[PDB]
Design an enzyme around this catalytic site. Structure first.
Site, PDB file in Angstrom:
ATOM      1  N   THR A  10       0.788  -1.238   0.000  1.00 21.68           N
ATOM      2  CA  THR A  10       0.000   0.000   0.000  1.00 21.68           C
ATOM      3  C   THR A  10       0.824   1.294   0.000  1.00 21.68           C
ATOM      4  O   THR A  10       0.290   2.363  -0.286  1.00 21.68           O
ATOM      5  CB  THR A  10      -0.973   0.046   1.211  1.00 21.68           C
ATOM      6  N   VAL A  13       6.611   2.811  -2.245  1.00 23.11           N
ATOM      7  CA  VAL A  13       7.421   1.791  -2.921  1.00 23.11           C
ATOM      8  C   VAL A  13       6.542   0.614  -3.357  1.00 23.11           C
ATOM      9  O   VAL A  13       6.673   0.112  -4.476  1.00 23.11           O
ATOM     10  CB  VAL A  13       8.582   1.280  -2.035  1.00 23.11           C
ATOM     11  N   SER A  39      -4.566  -1.571   6.731  1.00 20.47           N
ATOM     12  CA  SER A  39      -4.991  -1.826   5.353  1.00 20.47           C
ATOM     13  C   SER A  39      -5.638  -3.200   5.130  1.00 20.47           C
ATOM     14  O   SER A  39      -6.264  -3.428   4.092  1.00 20.47           O
ATOM     15  CB  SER A  39      -3.808  -1.655   4.393  1.00 20.47           C
ATOM     16  N   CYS A 127      18.464   3.783  -1.715  1.00 22.34           N
ATOM     17  CA  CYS A 127      18.086   4.340  -3.019  1.00 22.34           C
ATOM     18  C   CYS A 127      19.132   5.272  -3.637  1.00 22.34           C
ATOM     19  O   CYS A 127      19.396   5.209  -4.846  1.00 22.34           O
ATOM     20  CB  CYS A 127      16.726   5.044  -2.934  1.00 22.34           C
ATOM     21  N   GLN A 154      17.644  15.010  -2.840  1.00 25.75           N
ATOM     22  CA  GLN A 154      16.740  13.874  -2.735  1.00 25.75           C
ATOM     23  C   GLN A 154      15.272  14.242  -2.677  1.00 25.75           C
ATOM     24  O   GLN A 154      14.865  15.187  -1.991  1.00 25.75           O
ATOM     25  CB  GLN A 154      17.120  12.959  -1.558  1.00 25.75           C
ATOM     26  N   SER A 157       9.487  11.393  -1.856  1.00 23.97           N
ATOM     27  CA  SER A 157       8.805  10.085  -1.935  1.00 23.97           C
ATOM     28  C   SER A 157       9.613   8.979  -1.265  1.00 23.97           C
ATOM     29  O   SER A 157       9.062   7.950  -0.873  1.00 23.97           O
ATOM     30  CB  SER A 157       8.479   9.694  -3.384  1.00 23.97           C
ATOM     31  N   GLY A 158      10.922   9.211  -1.142  1.00 26.99           N
ATOM     32  CA  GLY A 158      11.819   8.334  -0.396  1.00 26.99           C
ATOM     33  C   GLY A 158      11.495   8.238   1.088  1.00 26.99           C
ATOM     34  O   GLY A 158      11.906   7.284   1.747  1.00 26.99           O
ATOM     35  N   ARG A 244      17.426  16.805   1.477  1.00 20.64           N
ATOM     36  CA  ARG A 244      16.077  16.730   0.925  1.00 20.64           C
ATOM     37  C   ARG A 244      15.708  18.053   0.254  1.00 20.64           C
ATOM     38  O   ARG A 244      15.868  19.126   0.842  1.00 20.64           O
ATOM     39  CB  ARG A 244      15.062  16.433   2.035  1.00 20.64           C
ATOM     40  N   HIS A 251      15.896  11.125  -7.424  1.00 23.91           N
ATOM     41  CA  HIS A 251      17.057  11.675  -6.744  1.00 23.91           C
ATOM     42  C   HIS A 251      18.103  12.126  -7.749  1.00 23.91           C
ATOM     43  O   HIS A 251      18.319  11.469  -8.772  1.00 23.91           O
ATOM     44  CB  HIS A 251      17.676  10.630  -5.810  1.00 23.91           C
TER      45      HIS A 251
HETATM   46  N1  LIG Z   1      -3.535   9.062  -1.196  1.00 24.20           N
HETATM   47  C1  LIG Z   1      -4.139   7.897  -0.967  1.00 24.20           C
HETATM   48  O1  LIG Z   1      -5.543   7.758  -1.018  1.00 24.20           O
HETATM   49  C2  LIG Z   1      -3.297   6.699  -0.643  1.00 24.20           C
HETATM   50  C3  LIG Z   1      -2.467   6.172  -1.633  1.00 24.20           C
HETATM   51  C4  LIG Z   1      -1.409   5.339  -1.278  1.00 24.20           C
HETATM   52  C5  LIG Z   1      -1.197   5.045   0.068  1.00 24.20           C
HETATM   53  N2  LIG Z   1      -2.017   5.559   1.043  1.00 24.20           N
HETATM   54  C6  LIG Z   1      -1.797   5.248   2.477  1.00 24.20           C
HETATM   55  O2  LIG Z   1      -0.864   6.150   3.053  1.00 24.20           O
HETATM   56  C7  LIG Z   1       0.017   5.454   3.918  1.00 24.20           C
HETATM   57  C8  LIG Z   1       1.360   6.170   4.001  1.00 24.20           C
HETATM   58  O3  LIG Z   1       2.380   5.329   4.496  1.00 24.20           O
HETATM   59  P1  LIG Z   1       3.705   5.957   5.157  1.00 24.20           P
HETATM   60  O4  LIG Z   1       3.835   7.379   4.748  1.00 24.20           O
HETATM   61  O5  LIG Z   1       3.716   5.615   6.596  1.00 24.20           O
HETATM   62  O6  LIG Z   1       4.910   5.118   4.483  1.00 24.20           O
HETATM   63  P2  LIG Z   1       5.089   4.296   3.109  1.00 24.20           P
HETATM   64  O7  LIG Z   1       6.533   4.015   2.955  1.00 24.20           O
HETATM   65  O8  LIG Z   1       4.561   5.012   1.931  1.00 24.20           O
HETATM   66  O9  LIG Z   1       4.332   2.900   3.334  1.00 24.20           O
HETATM   67  C9  LIG Z   1       4.778   2.036   4.351  1.00 24.20           C
HETATM   68  C10 LIG Z   1       4.227   0.638   4.120  1.00 24.20           C
HETATM   69  O10 LIG Z   1       4.584  -0.156   5.231  1.00 24.20           O
HETATM   70  C11 LIG Z   1       3.444  -0.862   5.671  1.00 24.20           C
HETATM   71  N3  LIG Z   1       3.527  -1.199   7.097  1.00 24.20           N
HETATM   72  C12 LIG Z   1       3.753  -0.347   8.146  1.00 24.20           C
HETATM   73  N4  LIG Z   1       3.750  -1.070   9.287  1.00 24.20           N
HETATM   74  C13 LIG Z   1       3.520  -2.362   8.979  1.00 24.20           C
HETATM   75  C14 LIG Z   1       3.412  -3.506   9.762  1.00 24.20           C
HETATM   76  N5  LIG Z   1       3.540  -3.421  11.088  1.00 24.20           N
HETATM   77  N6  LIG Z   1       3.168  -4.722   9.155  1.00 24.20           N
HETATM   78  C15 LIG Z   1       3.038  -4.806   7.778  1.00 24.20           C
HETATM   79  N7  LIG Z   1       3.140  -3.663   7.003  1.00 24.20           N
HETATM   80  C16 LIG Z   1       3.377  -2.461   7.600  1.00 24.20           C
HETATM   81  C17 LIG Z   1       2.278   0.063   5.360  1.00 24.20           C
HETATM   82  O11 LIG Z   1       1.031  -0.600   5.329  1.00 24.20           O
HETATM   83  P3  LIG Z   1      -0.327   0.163   5.785  1.00 24.20           P
HETATM   84  O12 LIG Z   1      -0.906   0.887   4.599  1.00 24.20           O
HETATM   85  O13 LIG Z   1      -1.337  -0.852   6.253  1.00 24.20           O
HETATM   86  O14 LIG Z   1      -0.023   1.131   6.905  1.00 24.20           O
HETATM   87  C18 LIG Z   1       2.704   0.617   4.017  1.00 24.20           C
HETATM   88  O15 LIG Z   1       2.328  -0.263   2.983  1.00 24.20           O
HETATM   89  C19 LIG Z   1       0.102   4.039   3.367  1.00 24.20           C
HETATM   90  O16 LIG Z   1       0.303   3.122   4.417  1.00 24.20           O
HETATM   91  C20 LIG Z   1      -1.245   3.841   2.695  1.00 24.20           C
HETATM   92  O17 LIG Z   1      -2.120   3.121   3.535  1.00 24.20           O
HETATM   93  C21 LIG Z   1      -3.059   6.380   0.695  1.00 24.20           C
HETATM   94  N1  LIG Z   2      14.667   8.046   3.593  1.00 23.10           N
HETATM   95  C1  LIG Z   2      14.964   7.481   2.286  1.00 23.10           C
HETATM   96  C2  LIG Z   2      16.229   6.626   2.327  1.00 23.10           C
HETATM   97  C3  LIG Z   2      16.226   5.647   3.483  1.00 23.10           C
HETATM   98  O1  LIG Z   2      16.722   5.971   4.551  1.00 23.10           O
HETATM   99  C4  LIG Z   2      15.630   4.268   3.327  1.00 23.10           C
HETATM  100  F1  LIG Z   2      14.436   4.346   2.766  1.00 23.10           F
HETATM  101  F2  LIG Z   2      15.512   3.713   4.521  1.00 23.10           F
HETATM  102  P1  LIG Z   2      16.713   3.233   2.304  1.00 23.10           P
HETATM  103  O2  LIG Z   2      16.162   1.846   2.525  1.00 23.10           O
HETATM  104  O3  LIG Z   2      18.095   3.440   2.878  1.00 23.10           O
HETATM  105  O4  LIG Z   2      16.560   3.734   0.886  1.00 23.10           O
HETATM  106  C5  LIG Z   2      15.141   8.582   1.278  1.00 23.10           C
HETATM  107  O5  LIG Z   2      15.310   9.746   1.688  1.00 23.10           O
HETATM  108  O6  LIG Z   2      15.115   8.308   0.061  1.00 23.10           O
END
Ligand SMILES: NC(=O)c1ccc[n+]([C@@H]2O[C@H](COP(=O)([O-])OP(=O)(O)OC[C@H]3O[C@@H](n4cnc5c(N)ncnc54)[C@H](OP(=O)(O)O)[C@@H]3O)[C@@H](O)[C@H]2O)c1
Ligand SMILES: N[C@H](CC(=O)C(F)(F)P(=O)(O)O)C(=O)O
Ligand SMILES: NC(=O)c1ccc[n+]([C@@H]2O[C@H](COP(=O)([O-])OP(=O)(O)OC[C@H]3O[C@@H](n4cnc5c(N)ncnc54)[C@H](OP(=O)(O)O)[C@@H]3O)[C@@H](O)[C@H]2O)c1
Ligand SMILES: N[C@H](CC(=O)C(F)(F)P(=O)(O)O)C(=O)O
Ligand code: NA
Lengths: 358, 357
Positions: A10, A13, A39, A127, A154, A157-158, A244, A251
């Site tokens: 979700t 990446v 999710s 990355c 950078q 989105s990273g 950043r 990047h």
């Molecule tokens: N704009 C939109 O309508 C839209 C589009 C894409 C994504 N999203 C949501 O936005 C969230 C942003 O994530 P982010 O900024 O925190 O980082 P991210 O790097 O974009 O996503 C982190 C990923 O790690 C997963 N994760 C975190 N903890 C976990 C666990 N304990 N066990 C298994 N998987 C785990 C998340 O799943 P989970 O999603 O369940 O947390 C997600 O898939 C996403 O998680 C997604 O649900 C919304």
């Molecule tokens: N924060 C990320 C880089 C990271 O620190 C990371 F996602 F954990 P990596 O697994 O080392 O690519 C970024 O700025 O692009």
């Protein structure tokens, strides 16, 4: 064919892992999307099929041939060892296993050879490190590498989907609502887990990840440590400044190197042009150089602004750009899996070399 | 007091020159604003007063004591020699006179001494060079400088008012209209005078100014040649990469140096903190480092992320940020004018050394 699981399906990446899998040659019989409890139950597409998202658990990996992990270091630490025990081959996008000597740290164009002795987990490198390895490896092969000094530019989105949304919100507040950049509220950047948060809109933040003991950040040290492992040479001096900037994807890097032997620029250009996964975009007469906005959507790594240092005989400067969610993450992972298939390395590992954390 | 003219008063720098003069100690009896024919007649404020913008001509400099130029290289080429003829002291914010041996190239904190032998023109250095000089001089004083490697993160205001508006439009079109950055139409950036123009929105453009015959840009070469002149040492090795990023104001720089003798990091921090015009913002335990958005509006140059190279014993990395329109241009120019006043150097030049065109 394979049963393939995407852990963190979700996230930013994860979405690209889905796209790269959809466009992959891998024979996939079954796909599974795993994420957190947040999710679980929701639905996500694979091509035209509806896939129900599952909570990632210790018992969720039965029948899985290949699992791609991109759900943070914590998730990989907890669940990747259980996947290996189930008989999976894990391609891990996190930093958790990268410096483990039982774990290959792979950019397929550079060190595919390392895959042969895997023990169930292959680590996708950082990355920013990945794209620098693609650019520099053809140079090292011919003239050697003594040192690298890199300053990065950078994309947000990273730092994940939340960071993307924060950046767009902040920019919209400034450009549409007239909010001053220093009056913006931030919740995630520069580093989600760190104590203080700063605006990225119209800013440049010289902090990616948290600070380490030596006043370099973890991102900067990962560039140092991962370069040495990937290129299998601890003698390569590497120092980084990781910054950043207000870019959503791709990047860019200002890379300085000193080679071991004088490397004629026109030959360096030809060497990079001829290297798989690298594209030469260097024609200053027509203002041709790599650009973040042009690299978005491409699996390739783009290199230009190539020129010798004005004083250092063996010094060369260059500009390196790649899509951080593609070659920086999801494409590198899928490419690893394709290479595993090619080499007949997709099979259970008998001996478990990784702690079960429950 | 003085009669002070601002040439190019309507531009991005011109507006900051006004603001810096309004906030200056300089004793000003009469203020004049000069620009092109398009502005001639219109009115701009000096504090509460209404000043009518005049057209810049070769005869418009009679009675002027100090002229600040920021109206492009060709405007200084044509008119500055006539100002010197008229008895004016010119502070030029263009690259045109910078490499002329008869012209001091000055950052007051670094080489104020060079002002004493001026011949009617003093050049303000390139914006990205100035802030680097403020950061590095205190280090050079104590441990010397062997080489500099610098990668810049430059704000769009450096390219002028039109570059700001182009950046804002592009970003709005991406965020509001769903236009992909790929498909944006550009007319100014990376360089106004160059043949092709690219979007800056969500981008990093490794081109500032046009390319020279050695594949470095004029911007990168300016940082090299101007450093050598300001620090009066042609033996300092300088190589630059100059990059435009989507920031409206304030330049950031990743600066690598190698000193002549090993410079302990805490002493480097202390030397920079003690140097006038430089501010130490370096406390990583509390995520303190210079930031573009924080530097906007301030005359100071902010230095942080200071740390030894991981391998080179004399190598040091740092992060330098300053408002490019202030210390980078308008404030450096006004500070020069204040330094000229302090040293009794505001007077007509007897021998003309610059050709009338
Ligand atoms: N704009 C939109 O309508 C839209 C589009 C894409 C994504 N999203 C949501 O936005 C969230 C942003 O994530 P982010 O900024 O925190 O980082 P991210 O790097 O974009 O996503 C982190 C990923 O790690 C997963 N994760 C975190 N903890 C976990 C666990 N304990 N066990 C298994 N998987 C785990 C998340 O799943 P989970 O999603 O369940 O947390 C997600 O898939 C996403 O998680 C997604 O649900 C919304
Ligand atoms: N924060 C990320 C880089 C990271 O620190 C990371 F996602 F954990 P990596 O697994 O080392 O690519 C970024 O700025 O692009
Ligand atoms: N919307 C836009 O794209 C934007 C916004 C504001 C202004 N402009 C105009 O576009 C031109 C260049 O763009 P920019 O944004 O890069 O401007 P700028 O650098 O911010 O300003 C340049 C300054 O130089 C002055 N100048 C130019 N030619 C001159 C001459 N021959 N003699 C005396 N003074 C002269 C201009 O006065 P004048 O104003 O009289 O020309 C202006 O004050 C400027 O002349 C400026 O006026 C463009
Ligand atoms: N393009 C400007 C710098 C210049 O090229 C300049 F305005 F001409 P200078 O007078 O040398 O600062 C910038 O990127 O900020
Ligand atoms: Na095979």
């Amino acid at each position: 064919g394979y049963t393939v699981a995407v852990v963190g399906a979700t996230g930013a990446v994860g979405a690209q892992m889905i796209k790269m899998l959809e466009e992959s040659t891998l024979p996939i019989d079954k796909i599974r999307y795993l994420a957190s409890a947040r999710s679980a139950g929701k639905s996500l597409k694979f091509k035209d099929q509806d896939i129900t998202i599952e909570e990632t658990t210790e018992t969720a990996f039965e029948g899985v041939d290949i699992a791609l992990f991109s759900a943070g270091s914590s998730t990989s630490a907890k669940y990747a060892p259980y996947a290996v025990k189930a008989g999976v081959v894990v391609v891990d996008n996190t930093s958790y296993f990268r410096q483990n000597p039982d774990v290959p740290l792979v950019v397929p164009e550079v060190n595919a050879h390392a895959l042969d002795a895997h023990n169930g987990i292959i680590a996708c490198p950082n990355c920013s490190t990945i794209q620098m390895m693609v650019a520099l490896e053809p140079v090292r092969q011919k003239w050697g590498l003594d040192r690298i000094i890199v300053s990065t530019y950078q994309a947000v989105s990273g730092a994940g989907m939340g960071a993307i949304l924060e950046t767009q919100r902040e920019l919209r507040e400034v450009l549409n609502d007239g909010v001053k950049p220093c009056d913006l509220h931030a919740e995630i950047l520069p580093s989600g887990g760190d104590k203080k948060h700063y605006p990225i809109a119209f800013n440049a933040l010289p902090q990616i990840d948290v600070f380490t003991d030596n006043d370099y950040t973890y991102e900067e040290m990962k560039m140092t440590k991962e370069t040495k492992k990937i290129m299998e040479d601890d003698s390569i001096a590497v120092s980084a400044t990781c910054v950043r900037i207000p870019v959503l994807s791709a990047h860019s890097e200002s890379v300085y190197i000193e080679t071991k032997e004088v490397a004629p620029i026109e030959e360096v250009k030809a060497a990079i042009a001829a290297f798989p996964g690298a594209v030469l975009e260097d024609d200053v007469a027509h203002q041709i150089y790599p650009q973040a906005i042009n690299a978005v959507g491409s699996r390739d790594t783009f290199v230009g602004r190539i020129r010798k240092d004005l004083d250092a005989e063996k010094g060369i400067h260059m500009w390196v750009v790649s899509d951080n969610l593609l070659k920086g993450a999801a494409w590198n992972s899928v490419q690893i899996a394709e290479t595993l298939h090619e080499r007949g390395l997709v099979r259970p590992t008998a001996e478990l070399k990784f702690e079960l954390k429950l």
